Ligand binder design. Sequence first.
Ligand SMILES: C=C1[C@H](COP(=O)(O)OP(=O)(O)OP(=O)(O)O)[C@@H](O)C[C@@H]1n1cnc2c(=O)nc(N)[nH]c21
Ligand SMILES: [Mg+2]
Lengths: 553, 406
Amino acid sequence: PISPIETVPVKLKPGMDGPKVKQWPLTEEKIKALVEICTEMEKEGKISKIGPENPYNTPVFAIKKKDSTKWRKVVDFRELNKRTQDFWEVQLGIPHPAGLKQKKSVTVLDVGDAFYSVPLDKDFRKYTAFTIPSINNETPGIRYQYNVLPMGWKGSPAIFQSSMTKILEPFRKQNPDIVIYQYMDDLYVGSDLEIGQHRTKIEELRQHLLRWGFTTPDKKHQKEPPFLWMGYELHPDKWTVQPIVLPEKDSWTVNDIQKLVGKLNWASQIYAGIKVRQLSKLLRGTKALTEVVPLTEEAELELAENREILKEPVHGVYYDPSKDLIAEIQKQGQGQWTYQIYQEPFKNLKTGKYARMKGAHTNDVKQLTEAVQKIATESIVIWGKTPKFKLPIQKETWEAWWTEYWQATWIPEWEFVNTPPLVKLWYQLEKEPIIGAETFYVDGAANRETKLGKAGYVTDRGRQKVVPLTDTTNQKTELQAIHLALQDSGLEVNIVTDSQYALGIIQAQPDKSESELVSQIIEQLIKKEKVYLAWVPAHKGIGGNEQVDKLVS
Amino acid sequence: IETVPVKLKPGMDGPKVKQWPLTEEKIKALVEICTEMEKEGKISKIGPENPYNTPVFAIKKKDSTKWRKLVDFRELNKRTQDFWEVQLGIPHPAGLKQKKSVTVLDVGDAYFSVPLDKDFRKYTAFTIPSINNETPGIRYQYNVLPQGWKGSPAIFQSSMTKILEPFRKQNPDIVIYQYMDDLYVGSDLEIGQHRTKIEELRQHLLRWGGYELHPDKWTVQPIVLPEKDSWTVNDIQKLVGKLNWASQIYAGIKVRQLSKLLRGTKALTEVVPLTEEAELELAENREILKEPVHGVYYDPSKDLIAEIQKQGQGQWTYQIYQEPFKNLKTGKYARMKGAHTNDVKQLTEAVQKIATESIVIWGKTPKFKLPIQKETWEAWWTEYWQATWIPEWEFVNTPPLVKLWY
DNA sequence: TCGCCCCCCTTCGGTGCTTTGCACCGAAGGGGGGC
Ligand SMILES: C=C1[C@H](COP(=O)(O)OP(=O)(O)OP(=O)(O)O)[C@@H](O)C[C@@H]1n1cnc2c(=O)nc(N)[nH]c21
Ligand SMILES: [Mg+2]
C-alpha cells in the first residue's frame, strides 16, 4: 500500500536540471526480477509509464536481499543525487543494546516495502525517470518514473524516517510506558505489561501502521527471545553480537587487513582488550588495495591474541537506571587503551577501546584524558549521563600534572585502581635551577636555503661542542642542541635555550613522539635525575647564550 | 504586525551545524520547552527538507533552578546581514561602567511577540536529539524573533525603547543597555536599594511581557617585576627576557645595562650583585610598568580579542586588545568554589566574567583565545555556562616563555 | 555500478605563525556495522 501521508516537498539545487544518462546491460535473471517488481510496482501504483516528452533518465540495477531469494531494485541516482537539494539528516546515531533496560515483553517488527509505501512529491517525480533494459538488444526499454521513494535517491532515507516518525507519534503519546526503538523501518517494542496486554498493544500498533499504509509482514515479526536486532541477539537477561568471522589468509592484501581491522573494531564493543595497532601499522605507506603485505611478527602476535579473545563467549547486560554507571580503563601499551562499562562487577554493559594518536608529541596522562573524554561522550549518547571512573593513575600523579601544565584540564569523579601498568609522568622539570649542576647554554642554527646547520653548547664549567648537521631545519637544530646537552651532561643539569619551539615541546612533558629526534630527547630526559630548562631571547648578547650563538656561527 | 525583510550576507548560506550529545535532563527540558513553544506557535515542527541546523542545549542558573533553552546561533549571527547598514543597531552608553552596581535581566521572552520574516525562518532550524538514538532527531524552526539571534534586538529595538521610556524618565541616573537577550541595568544606589529598583523594572516589563556586578573594583593587573635582595644569574635572565617582551608594549625600556651584568658563561645559581647602572635601569622600568600605556584607544569598528593564561591556585590572568600589544585592559580573574578541583569550570567562569566586562565596557564580547584543548573544552563547558549569549572562541596551546602577567 | 547514519585508521591539504617547517584540524579514502 501507499501511505496517504503528505508528501515532503523537494527541490533540485539552484541552476541545476535533471539527470540524462543511458541504461547499461544487465542479466536475464535480474531483468525478469525487475519486470516482476516493475509491472507489479506499476500495478501497485509505485511507478508510472512515461514517454519521450520527459527528457530525463537514470540507469537501474538489482542486488540480492538477506530475506531468502528476494531481490532489491535499486537505481543509480548518482547524477540526480548531486543535483538534488541538501537535507538535514535526522538519524543522529545508532542505538546500542547496552542502553536498553530490561523489559517484561519484547517484540521486533519490520515494515514491508518501507520506502515504496511513502509517496514522492509530485513535482519531483519526473526527475526519477528510468528505463528497464530486458536483454538490452531485443527492443528499446520501457520508461517509468517513481511515485514513491526510490532506493538509491539521496533524500529517501530522511523522508522515510521523518514520515515514520510522524506516523508513530499518535501512538507514542498514547502509550508512554511502551518503548519503541525506531531504526529505519525496524521497530523494537518493549513494555512491562503482561504478554496478553502486550500482544494487544502490538496488534493495535500494527493496525495504526496499516491504516497509514505500512504493512508488518509475519516473517519479520519476532515475538520470542532471542530477538535479532541491529546485529545483536537480545536475550531476557543478556545480549550478544551476532557471530564475528575473521578472515583467515595465508597471503594478505591491504584490503584484507583493512577488513580485519574493521571486524576487530566492531568486536571491541563487547570483547575486552582487542588491539589493532600492529595490524593497522601494516596499512601505512601502502599504495594499492591489492598490494600484498607480509604480516610483521608483532602483527601476527596481536592477531593471535585477538583470536584468543574472540574464542571465548561474551555477553553484555542491560542498563539499570537505579544504579551507577562505572567506567574502568587499562593501559595496553603504545598509546592503546581499553575500557569496560558496568554497574555490577564482572557484568559489562559494553567494552571499547581508544587508540588514536593525537598530535606529534604527547604523553600517557593526556591520552588517558582523551580516553576519558571519548567514554564520557559515548556514555551521554547511550545512557544520558556520564559514569564514575576507575583509573590506573595515582591522585598525586594527576595533581602533579594539572598544576605543572599550562592548559586547563580536568577529569570527573574518579577512583584510583591499581591495575599495572599505571599511568605516570616519566620525568618532571625542576621549577628552580639546580645548585651544583652544570649550566649548558645551547643553540642550533640552520641555513634555510642550504638545509645545513650546526648544534652546540657552552658551559659554565668551560665545556664546548659544535656538531655539523646535514639536511636539517631551524627547529631540528634547536632540538639537536638540547639533545647534545642532555647527552654530555651528568644526572643533574641546567639548560638555557633561546628556542620557544623546543621549550614548548619539552615543557609539556611528552613521553612519546612521532619524531625520532624528540623520542631520543625523551629517553634522555627520563634517565636524568633533575633537569632545569630555561629560555632567553636570542640575539640580545646575554651571557652564555651570546657565546654559544657566536660559536654556532 | 508585519515582518521586517531580512537577508543573509551576500554569497553566504545558512548554518549547517550538527547537534552534539545531550544529557537526559537537558533533553527532557528541551522537549518540554519546545512542545509548549510549539503549542503557542512560537516554533513549528519541520522535516529534513530544510537543510539548515544549529545546535541547541540548555542551562540552569542555580538561583533560578528552572531550565533555559539556549540555541547556539553564533554561526547564524555571523551570516546575518548587519543592522548598522539598515540603521537598526543599538548604541552603547559610556556611563554603564561608571555605576557601582549593574544587574543583568534576561528579557529574551519579549522577542516572542514579534513574527519573523517567513523567508528567513528556515535558517533557524534546530534538532532535539534522543537518548541512545531511540528515535530520529526532532526538528523545529522559529516563527518569531528567536532568542540569541542578533537580529532580534535590532528588530525589537523601537518597541523596547517604548516599554523602557517611562522607567528611565522616572530614573534619569539609571543606565540601561540592551545586549542580545539581556538588559544591563546599573546605578549608584545602596546594594539593597539598587535591588529594590531592579524589582520595579521587572514588574513594568511583566505588565506587557542575575547577581550584582560591581565595575568599580575590576582592578587592572599590571606587569610586575620581582623584588629581591640578592639576584641570581637565573633571576636576571628571567628578568631581562620579561622586559624584552614588554618592550613590545611599553616605550623606551632598557636592558643593555642588565644584559651585560651577565657577561660570560655563568652558573645559573651564581649570585650577581646589582650595579648602580643596573639598579638605575631596573627601578626606572618598574615606574614605566606602574602606570598604563599612552596612545591606546578603543576602536568600535574592530573586534575585541581576549587572551587568558592559567596561573595556578585558582588564578587566571587576561588581556583584552584589538591590535597586538595594545591592551585595552589587563586583569586577573580569581574564583574559589572551596574545592579548587576544576580548571574547566574555572576557565568557563572566567570567560563569562571577562565577556560580561566587555559588554559593560564596550558593548560587545571579545573573541577568546582559550588555553585549553578543543576536545577537553567541548566535553564539559556547557555544564558551567550561565549566560544567554555565547562568545566566539578558538583554542591555543601557548607554552609560557616568560610569566609576563605574574 | 545505489542511498542515509554511526564507529576507527590513514592520508591529504588548507591555515596561520611576529614561520621558511610545523602543528593543528577537517575532509576524504579505506574498512566495520545498521536499515
Ligand atoms: C532502510 C531501507 C528500507 C529497509 O529495508 P528492508 O531490508 O527492511 O526491506 P524493505 O522494507 O524494503 O522490504 P522488506 O522489509 O519486505 O524486505 C528499504 O525500504 C530501503 C532502505 N534500504 C535498505 N537496504 C538498502 C540498500 O541497500 N540500498 C538502499 N538504497 N536502500 C536500502
Ligand atoms: Mg522493511
